[PDB]
Amino acid sequence: GLVPRGSHMRIALMQHTARPLDPQHNLDLIDDAAARASEQGAQLLLTPLLFGFGYVPSQICAQVSAEQVDAARSRLRGIARDRGIALVWSLPGPEGPEQRGITAELADEHGEVLASYQKVQLYGPEEKAAFVPGEQPPPVLSWGGRQLSLLVCYDVEFPEMVRAAAARGAQLVLVPTALAGDETSVPGILLPARAVENGITLAYANHCGPEGGLVFDGGSVVVGPAGQPLGELGVEPGLLVVDLPDADYLQDRRAELHRNWL
Amino acid sequence: GLVPRGSHMRIALMQHTARPLDPQHNLDLIDDAAARASEQGAQLLLTPLLFGFGYVPSQICAQVSAEQVDAARSRLRGIARDRGIALVWSLPGPEGPEQRGITAELADEHGEVLASYQKVQLYGPEEKAAFVPGEQPPPVLSWGGRQLSLLVCYDVEFPEMVRAAAARGAQLVLVPTALAGDETSVPGILLPARAVENGITLAYANHCGPEGGLVFDGGSVVVGPAGQPLGELGVEPGLLVVDLPDADYLQDRRAELHRNWL
Query: Which residues lie closer than 8 Å to B139 by C-beta, 6 or more apart?
Result: B115, B116, B117, B149, B150, B168
Positions of E strands within chain A: 7-15, 44-46, 86-92, 102-107, 113-118, 140-143, 146-150, 172-176, 201-205, 208-211, 214-217, 221-223, 229-232, 238-245
State which approach was used to obtain the coordinates.
X-ray
| From B190, B247, B253, residue closest to A160, measured CB to CB | B253
| B120 touches A at CB < 8 Å | yes
Rg (CA), chain A: 17
Residue B146, domain CATH: 3.60.110.10
Q: How far apart are CA B149 and CA B203, in angstroms?
A: 10
Task: Tell me if B11 sits within 8 A of B42, measured CB to CB.
Answer: yes
Residue A71 sits in which domain range?
1-262
User: Got the DSSP string for B19-67?
Assistant: -TT-HHHHHHHHHHHHHHHHHTT-SEEE--TTTTT-S-HHHHHHH--HH
**Alpha-carbon distance A178 to nearest alpha carbon in chain B (angstroms):** 14
The total of other beta-carbon atoms located within 10 Å of residue A201's CB is: 23
Query: Edge to edge, what strands does the sheet with A113-118 contain?
Result: A113-118, A102-107, A86-92, A44-46, A7-15, A238-245
| Element housing B7 (H / E) | strand B7-15
Does residue A103 sit in helix, strand or coil? strand
End-to-end C-alpha distance for chain B, whole angstroms: 46
Query: Which residues lie closer than 8 Å to B131 by C-beta, 6 or more apart?
Result: B57, B61, B92, B93, B100, B101, B102, B119, B122
CB within 8 Å: A190 and B167: no
Contacts with A225 from chain B: Cβ below 8 Å: none
Query: Which residues lie closer than 8 Å to A251 by C-beta, 6 or more apart?
Result: none
A vs B, Cβ pairs < 8 A, gives 122
| B117 touches A at CB < 8 Å | no
Resolution (A): 1.6
| Domains of chain B: total | 1
CB within 8 Å: A260 and B259: yes
CB within 8 Å: A254 and B120: yes
Beta strands B140-143 and B146-150 are antiparallel
| From B154, B160, B252, residue closest to A261, measured CB to CB | B160
| A262 touches B at CB < 8 Å | yes
CB within 8 Å: A255 and B249: no
| From B133, B197, B226, residue closest to A159, measured CB to CB | B197
Task: Tell me if B34 sits within 8 A of B16, measured CB to CB.
Answer: no
| B197 touches A at CB < 8 Å | yes
CB within 8 Å: A262 and B252: no
